[PDB]
Design a protein around this ligand. Sequence first.
Ligand SMILES: [Cl-]
Ligand SMILES: [Cl-]
Length: 162
Amino acid sequence: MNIFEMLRIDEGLRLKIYKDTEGYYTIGIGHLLTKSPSLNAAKSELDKAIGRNTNGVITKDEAEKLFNQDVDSAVRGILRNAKLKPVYDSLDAVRRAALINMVFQMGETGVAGFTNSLRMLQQKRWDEAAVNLAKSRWYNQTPNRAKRVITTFRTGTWDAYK
Ligand SMILES: [Cl-]
Ligand SMILES: [Cl-]
């Protein structure tokens, strides 16, 4: 298992514009298009992201291409962030994937906001970090996905994904 396979399981793949769990226009493997309510504003972001007139539909290759860019960006954002970087540097390979997953979902700003859980992960207090991570809107809104990520932080294995 790796970060790509992990995120593909959590996000799914859809080739037509759809609304995510928050009601926002998305496409592909979890690629947020816009927070605006307008489907036209979403189609316009889509065409711009793909470089062609898509009429709201993309191919598998185009989905995978946005996905590779989004993972790359999540990693680079973590490495640029003064709060996240030290946590990432301290973790083993599996747990690094869990952190990337959270950043991919909620953005660097949102994750950097989990001040206490970050400190706990850095200190390697797995059980305590898992309890603190669950006291969040994140966990309450998307509990099945949150549990999978949290178990990955707790155990350092891919068991939740197998
Ligand atoms: Cl983009
Ligand atoms: Cl969920």
